Amino acid sequence: FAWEKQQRKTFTAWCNSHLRKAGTQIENIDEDFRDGLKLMLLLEVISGERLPKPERGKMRVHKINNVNKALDFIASKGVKLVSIGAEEIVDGNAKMTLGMIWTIILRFAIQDISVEETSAKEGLLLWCQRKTAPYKNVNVQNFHISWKDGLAFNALIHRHRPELIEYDKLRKDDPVTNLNNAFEVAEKYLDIPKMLDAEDIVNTARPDEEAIMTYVSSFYHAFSGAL
Known part of the structure; x- marks a missing residue:
């Protein structure tokens, strides 16, 4: 497909x-x-x-x-x-x-x-839900449509590194802009290479979840050396 x-x-x-x-x-x-x-x-x-x-x-x-x-x-x-x-x-x-x-x-x-008492795919999800809990118009429930508008990527980066993201500037109905902002910030500041194409994400009904988990897991590991 x-x-x-x-x-x-x-x-x-x-x-x-x-x-x-x-x-x-x-x-x-x-x-x-x-x-x-x-x-x-x-x-x-x-x-x-x-x-x-x-x-x-x-x-x-x-x-x-x-x-x-x-x-x-x-x-x-x-x-x-x-x-x-x-x-x-x-x-x-x-x-x-x-x-x-x-x-x-x-x-x-x-x-x-390993996040609280959950591990693996389930643990990675809980971590994303914890980190994005307070963010407007984010509700992570999966590794597909939850990520499609770009806001959860931005919320995830902002919660760890608020200086890198102007979260309130971002428009839910501007998903390509949101996606590229996060991709670019992660590439430049967190040394996470671009792994997703913004267009593909927006132009697919349901984005590939394996591809999304792959990219999100690299955020998990970038941010794991803290606290």
Whole structure:
């Protein structure tokens, strides 16, 4: 669907926000993980742990072996992999590749989030509801339509860094302006790379929730070193 365009953009940007720390980047998410090398690198950055030595030989076995090293590692963190195999990743299955990157985001960015007595996706939601409670015209109830007008992004940033956001200036019926304001402020001041397209968000009835959770989780981690 339009899910796929959104996820390609967001998951690439998310991966790159981590790969920069390992001195590299991907450009094409359905080509650039096929040899398994940057996939293994990504896992090393986000876990802080070393994976086995990759094979650099460029034959299909090597790439399969590299991708299995990555999958075996994800599984060692208690992930039950579903409908993901190394051959299909190496062979460029785009939907499966997106699925595998989401699995990685969920485990390594989301799962360990702990807020009051809730964790993971539920904990990330409660955190957003707590931080945005007093803000006019914000009501976070999900990771889709709640985020679509741009105000919750701005409220979330304002609650931590009020000097960066003029919240009262923002118009609910001006969602593209609100979205770009938050995206730009986060990129410049919080070192959170842009992962969402304002137009896509506004021009979709229901924005992709995986893509929204991915971006919001990076806000959670930017703001977690405080207090």
